């Protein structure tokens, strides 16, 4: 391994201390980076000073029956999947429990009070709910086909730039949800769908009362399906793609990098491939050591 001096802008973090990295070292091999202060613990394997400010760049309830319901689309863990239409294009989930319990009845009021504010771009926007005959949830219908269908039924392989950008936009979704102190259990492509322009939409985040590292672990398997449709990934793609997957699938929790770091890292992985897309030149002599 050979290392050269470098100053990082925007957002960058250490790889050993796993904290903010402004000015440090970078490795031409496997893109390894580390602080000088944290260099004392860095192996050959692939007076601290403070920092500062970084630059940055009940009417919902609806009656029953009026909706022109469609065909069953799937089967969830705690409900039935359907699509309807009522003054607009929506879809409704037919939940399980016929007679709501008193515990979830009032929790139904607060669960609506919580889900009414989560308005992320890469999540399927909440549209409504109902409990008049039985518990039910209304979720926006995707004006197209889901993620799982595209990559497994009527195969339409996407652009690698599109493929990673899908992961990039997917990264934007789960990261914000964790900022709401929300830990997810059923994060998988079976619950991921593609909207207009095949934009990523993530659902199955409801039932805050009736029902992060594990979420990244689940997110790790999701990104595996993208580049596979570990070593099976394309060699022509930036090698830092393999590194990102490797850290996200660690068995230990805190060893797995958290979502906030990955958003900046994914941006880096989407820059090396276009900036350097050709046969490699020659690297110069190393000028550092420990």
């Amino acid at each position: 391994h050979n290392f050269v001096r470098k100053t990082f802008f925007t957002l960058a973090f250490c790889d050993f201390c796993r904290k903010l990295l402004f000015q440090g070292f970078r490795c031409q091999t496997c893109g390894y980076k580390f602080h000088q202060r944290c260099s004392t613990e860095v192996p050959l394997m692939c007076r601290d000073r403070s920092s500062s400010a970084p630059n940055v760049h009940d009417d919902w309830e609806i009656p029953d029956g009026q909706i022109t319901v469609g065909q069953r689309i799937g089967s969830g863990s705690f409900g039935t999947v359907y699509k309807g239409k009522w003054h607009g294009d929506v879809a409704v989930k037919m939940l399980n429990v016929t007679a709501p319990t008193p515990q979830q009845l009032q929790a139904f009021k607060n669960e609506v009070g919580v889900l009414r504010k989560t308005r992320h771009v890469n999540i399927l926007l909440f549209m409504g709910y109902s409990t008049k005959p039985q518990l039910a949830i209304v979720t926006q219908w995707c004006e197209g086909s889901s993620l799982y269908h595209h990559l497994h039924i009527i195969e339409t392989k996407f652009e690698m730039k599109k493929l990673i950008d899908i992961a990039r936009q997917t990264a934007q979704g789960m990261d914000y949800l964790h900022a709401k102190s929300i830990i997810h259990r059923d994060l998988k492509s079976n619950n991921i769908f593609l909207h207009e322009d095949l934009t990523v939409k993530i659902g199955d985040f409801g039932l805050a009362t009736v029902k992060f590292q594990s979420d990244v672990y689940a997110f790790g398997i999701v990104l595996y399906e993208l580049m596979t449709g570990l070593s099976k990934v394309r060699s022509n793609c930036p090698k830092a793609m393999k590194r990102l997957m490797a850290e996200c699938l660690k068995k230990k929790r805190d060893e797995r990098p958290l979502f906030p770091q990955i958003l900046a890292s994914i941006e880096l992985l989407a820059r090396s491939l276009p900036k350097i897309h050709r046969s490699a030149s020659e690297p110069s002599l190393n000028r550092a050591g420990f």
């Binding site: 601290d48 403070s50 920092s51 504010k117 900022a179 709401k180 906030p260």
Partner: peptide
């Protein structure tokens, strides 16, 4: 008061704000 604009800056500075207490 969390907003899609607010949450990014809020945690980002607060995380680093909390870090200063640790090392100082």
């Amino acid at each position: 008061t969390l907003s899609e604009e607010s949450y990014k800056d809020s945690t980002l500075i607060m995380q680093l704000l909390r870090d200063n207490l640790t090392l100082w």
